[PDB]
Paper text:
LMW-PTP is a well-characterised phospho-tyrosine specific PTP, widely expressed in human tissues and conserved through evolution. The ligand-binding interface of LMW-PTP comprises the active site P-loop, the adjacent DPYY-loop (D-loop) and the variable region or variable loop. The catalytic residues C12 (nucleophile) and R18 (phosphate binding) are located in the P-loop, and D129 (general acid/base) in the D-loop. We demonstrate here that minimal re-design of LMW-PTP, by mutating only two residues, is sufficient to introduce new enzymatic activity towards four different phosphoinositide (PI) substrates.
Enzyme kinetics experiments for the dephosphorylation of phosphoinositides reveal that the RT, RTK and RKK mutant enzymes show selective specificity for PI5P, whereas RK has a broader specificity, with activity towards PI3P, PI4P, and PI5P and PIP2, with the highest efficacy towards PIP2. In order to assess the actual impact of the designed mutations on the protein structure, we determined the crystal structures of the I16K and L13R-I16K mutants at 1.8Å and 2.0Å resolution respectively. In both cases, the structures are similar to the WT enzyme with overall root-mean deviations (RMSDs) of 0.288 Å and 0.265 Å respectively. There are no structural distortions in main chain of the P-loop or the variable region, thus the mutations introduced do not alter the tertiary structure of the protein, consistent with a catalytically active enzyme. However, in both structures, the side chain of W49 is in the open position, away from the active site, thus confirming the flexibility of this side chain as suggested from the kinetics characterisation. In the structure of the RK mutant, the side chain of R13 points towards the centre of the active site interacting with a bound phosphate molecule and the catalytic D129. To evaluate if a PI molecule could fit in the crystal structure of the RK mutant, we performed docking with RosettaLigand using the PIP2 ligand, and allowing the side chains of the protein residues in the binding interface (R13, I16, W49, N50, R53, Y131 and Y132) to be flexible. The ligand docks in the pocket, with the phosphorus atom of the D3 phosphate at a distance of 3.3Å from the sulphur atom of C12, similar to the 3.2Å distance observed in the MTMR2-PIP2 complex. The new residues R13 and K16, both form interactions with the D5 and D1 phosphates respectively, and together with interactions with R53 they contribute to PIP2 binding. The crystals structure of R13-K16 design shows a larger active site pocket than the WT enzyme, which is compatible with binding of PI substrates.
Residue numbers in the entry: 5 to 157
The structure:
Amino acid sequence: TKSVLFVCRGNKCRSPIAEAVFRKLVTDQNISENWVIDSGAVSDWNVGRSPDPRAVSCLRNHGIHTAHKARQITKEDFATFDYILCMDESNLRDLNRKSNQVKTCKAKIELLGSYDPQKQLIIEDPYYGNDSDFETVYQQCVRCCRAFLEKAH
């Protein structure tokens, strides 16, 4: 059983989209039973909130739905997930530092964009953008999630 946790700042725009995309992916590939998939936030500020309505609408445009509610990453997440894939360098920096402070870190922390065959390394925060920015994030997650499933690094 493999595990991936998608992380962003507040867990309402980017990482809920990545989670839903990857869940759709493994389901189509008929291997969802062998994958634990989740998303979480660095911050605790947005905990308990549903994804941004623009993220929900973006996923719906692509026939996807999510019932995720924002949660903050926990010490346990570092000890149990195989991969923690984050969105921007602020996430990476924060995750690398908290990884140092847990004596039981099994997860490999990487930028999700590190898997983009199109080389766009950063998945930028779309909250203060518009719906076309959520579509961009979605397209980034599709390319990155598919590359990740084919070969991890």
